[PDB]
């Protein structure tokens, strides 16, 4: 039996990541101050709703986020959803803008 616990966690050191791989998407806080991460998760969700005609889904919460800027602003995200409940699955997705071409990607697993 587990009587009690506490845990301290961190994202991997941003300097040590940059030094290992300069272009790697640096991880960031998932809170609502990041409008563009919310745009990324809602764009990937909109793409998933456009791809999946059987059911439609709504954003519960964004669980992980990162971004990169090489081809342009490029956001990568994981987030939770429910139909239109306890959140029904985990989504994974992205949003990228170049100055001209634009890209959105999405994959989701139901629990």
């Amino acid at each position: 039996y587990l009587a009690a616990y506490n845990c301290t966690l961190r994202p991997v050191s941003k300097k040590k990541i940059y030094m290992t791989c300069p272009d790697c998407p640096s991880s960031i806080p998932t809170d609502s101050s990041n409008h563009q991460v919310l745009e990324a998760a809602t764009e990937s969700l909109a793409k998933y709703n456009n791809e999946n005609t059987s059911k439609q889904y709504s954003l519960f919460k964004v669980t992980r986020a990162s971004s990169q800027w090489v081809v342009g602003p490029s956001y990568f995200v994981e987030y939770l959803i429910k139909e239109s409940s306890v959140p029904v699955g985990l989504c994974k997705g992205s949003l990228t803008r170049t100055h001209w071409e634009k890209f959105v990607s999405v994959t989701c697993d139901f629990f």
Partner: protein
């Protein structure tokens, strides 16, 4: 910006895996970047065969590489849009132990970082490394470097630059995505001790009196002049009379003598590393319409002696007397020499000659189709926004007709040029499969430098796919048979598809710089080749 520790250096060929999660467009863009490495450096690539370290290229999130050889073998990612050749080249330069140019130890001497304008949580992507970690390779900081970040990178506000050059001119330049810079090659070569490019087999501009070790035949009647560019209109193609006493071309007069007199200009012997070469050159034919510039190969007859002639192409005069590009597919697998037979026809009806300059021989496929837009600066002024140009119909290796639309003044992007490939109907269409999917288009604005290490040719890449659709064709595939998907054009007497490619292909402020325009001639190459075999 190179990682000092020599253990971090690859040993060539770098063995690679392409993961099957990569699209075809990304697999073909990777192999096209490898060709640029092999063409501009001694960097080489091989398929994987169980080696201790290797690159695996991936379609993971984002577009990124560990820096230098990780001796376990390493991921590179190529997410969406990083299919662009220059972004593959940038990631492979990270794999080859290179950090970003704004991460040099001395970077603060050359670029401002506007920390206040960086997104909170991203300031560390502008860290600079100490000189124990990185060498300068005894090179200056290079704004033209492919390793440099553009002004609007990681910025809070789209209008406000994160990074700017202290020499303010270079704000318009930093973070170019054309190609390797000359200093990126100089660095890469210092890093790997590269002295010879794998595919640049020969180049010549005749600037030196030994004419690049070409020779003139004696079996022929006469000789080509090595011509001094000094006469009133008769300038070389290398320098266009910009530099006095210094431009040179081979010239073969046809204004006098008998018809059918000739001169052979013949290269020094050449040892091809591949089964195929492209002989590019620039030429004029201001003489008679019956003059003929014939390109020949003299090859090893298998005795080890180069004496077996092979005619390979003929060129003939036009009302366009201006310097024209040419490409000749050679297929030489044994030592040889490329030859130009200038041949007179009707000399009484000639006031000029055949001219050669800027010869380049690369062990590559030739561009599938080449378009030269004459007087391009003047065309660019005279073009109203939304006015268009269309290339003559070129034919691909599989016989698919195709061509490019060029809109010089992009209405979509004021100050940019728009290039858009389309399929054309042609003589083969009934036998070809449609839609023509899995065919990688590579458009390339030639940077007109004869030495391929001096070129930064802008190039964009897409692959035809079922994804490409329009309501204008009931949302059928754009790449279906042009009889049922394109609009008939009277000028080509052919059906041209809905056109696809890039608004913003290049800025006018970038096309003018770097010698892409040269003598007011926007030379666009196109390739349009199947890549289904990469699946």
């Amino acid at each position: 910006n190179g990682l000092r520790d020599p253990n971090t250096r690859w040993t060539f060929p770098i063995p690679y895996i392409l993961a099957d999660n990569l699209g075809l467009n990304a697999k073909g863009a990777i192999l096209y970047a490898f060709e640029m490495f092999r063409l501009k450096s001694c960097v080489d690539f091989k398929p994987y065969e169980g080696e201790s370290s290797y690159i695996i290229f991936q379609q993971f999130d984002g577009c990124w590489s560990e820096v230098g050889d990780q001796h376990v073998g390493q991921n590179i990612s190529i997410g969406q849009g990083c299919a662009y050749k220059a972004i593959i080249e940038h990631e492979i330069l990270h794999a080859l132990g290179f950090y970003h140019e704004q991460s040099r130890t001395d970077r603060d001497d050359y670029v401002n970082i506007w920390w206040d304008q960086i997104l909170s949580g991203y300031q560390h992507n502008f860290d600079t490394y100490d000189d124990s970690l990185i060498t300068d390779l005894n090179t200056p900081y290079d704004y033209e470097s492919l390793m440099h970040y553009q002004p609007f990178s990681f910025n809070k506000n789209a209008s406000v630059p994160t990074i700017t050059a202290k020499i303010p001119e270079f704000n318009s330049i930093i973070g170019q995505r054309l190609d390797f810079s000359a200093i990126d090659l100089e660095r890469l070569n210092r890093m790997y001790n590269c002295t010879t490019t794998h595919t640049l087999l020969d180049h010549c501009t005749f600037e030196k009196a030994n004419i690049c070790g070409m020779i003139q035949g004696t079996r022929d009647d006469t000789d080509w002049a090595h011509q001094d560019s000094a006469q009133a209109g008769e300038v070389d193609h290398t320098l266009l009379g910009q530099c006095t006493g210094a431009g040179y071309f081979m010239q073969f007069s046809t204004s006098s003598g008998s018809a059918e007199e000739a001169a052979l200009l013949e290269s020094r012997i050449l040892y091809p590393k591949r089964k195929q070469q492209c002989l590019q050159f620039f030429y004029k034919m201001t003489g008679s319409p019956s003059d003929r510039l014939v390109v020949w190969v003299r090859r090893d007859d298998s005795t080890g002696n180069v004496r077996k002639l092979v005619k390979v192409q003929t060129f003939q005069g036009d009302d366009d007397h201006n310097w024209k590009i040419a490409h000749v597919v050679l297929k030489e697998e044994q030592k040889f020499r490329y030859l130009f037979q200038g041949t007179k026809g009707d000399p009484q009806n000639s006031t000029g000659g055949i001219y050669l300059d800027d010869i380049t021989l690369t062990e590559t496929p030739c561009p599938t189709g080449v378009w030269t837009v004459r007087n391009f600066s003047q065309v660019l002024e005279n073009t109203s926004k939304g006015d268009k140009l269309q290339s003559p119909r070129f034919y691909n290796s599989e016989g698919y007709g195709f061509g490019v639309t060029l809109y010089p003044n992009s209405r979509e992007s004021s100050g940019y040029l728009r290039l858009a490939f389309h399929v054309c109907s042609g003589e083969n269409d009934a036998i070809l499969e449609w839609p023509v999917e899995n065919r990688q288009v590579i458009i390339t604005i030639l940077d007109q430098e004869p030495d391929v290490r001096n070129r930064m040719s802008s190039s964009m890449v897409f692959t035809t796919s079922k994804s490409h659709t329009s309501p204008a064709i009931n949302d059928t595939v754009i790449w279906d048979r042009p009889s049922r998907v394109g609009t008939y054009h009277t000028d080509c007497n052919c059906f041209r598809s809905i056109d696809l490619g890039w608004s913003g292909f290049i800025s006018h402020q970038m096309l003018k710089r770097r010698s892409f325009l040269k003598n007011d001639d926007l030379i666009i190459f196109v390739d349009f080749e199947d890549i289904t075999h990469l699946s």
